[PDB]
């Protein structure tokens, strides 16, 4: 996902190559940047 560029599947199982994430029950900054006001606050002439 980061700086990896092999087209073949890793020889070892995922369970060994990395730690495994568990669940309970750019996210925030991406939403913040996307919500930015990008116009003019007033009336526009020509």
């Amino acid at each position: 996902s980061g700086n990896t560029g092999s087209i073949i599947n890793n020889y070892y199982m995922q369970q060994y190559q990395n730690s495994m994430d568990t669940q309970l029950g750019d996210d925030w900054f991406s939403k913040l940047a996307s919500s930015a006001f990008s116009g003019l606050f007033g009336a526009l002439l020509a």
């Binding site: 990896t4 369970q15 060994y16 730690s19 495994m20 994430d21 568990t22 750019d26 940047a33």
Partner: protein, 219 residues
Amino acid sequence: GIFPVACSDGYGGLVTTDPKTADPAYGKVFNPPRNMLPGRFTNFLDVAEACPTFLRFEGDVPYVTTKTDSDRILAQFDLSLAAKHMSNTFLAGLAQYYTQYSGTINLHFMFTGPTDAKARYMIAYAPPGMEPPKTPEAAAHCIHAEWDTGLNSKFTFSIPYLSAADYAYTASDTAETTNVQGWVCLFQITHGKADGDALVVLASAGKDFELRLPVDART
């Protein structure tokens, strides 16, 4: 028999930035759950866009003060991510780890004077190839914007990316006497009883600001 193979010279050394992974040694570990922790960011430029940070002016302050004298230049500096004026911004902190960039840089201006203090300002972009303007009249011929104070204390202006090549360098070469990318010129057209009042300015990345080619140069 067995599969014949050619162990090739010139391949196989460790490369600090190679695209492959190491062999594992300790398997089956499950991590504590961490889904939906607040404040996550996945790209440094999203925060550079969303969080403008302060410029630095003479005296180590993030503002420029209105003056009363024939000189109407409030600030004039090299459009460079290596400029002293930008040295304390998040944008400059990020830029030092890349060699090239392109795109828009936004400047934000916030008036801080009392309600009975009024002023009119002008921001201009002077391209390289000619000395920057010393007066608002001369700068009028450049790409520019003028605005005054009122209910809304803030004004934002996009400094355009204009260059011969598609990318510009983030660093400034020592053999580079005149700034390669031009100057941003902040003027004061006039003011009404705004002596000593501060206009604070911030900078953030624009919609198409882009950094490329990571580099570790110390710093």
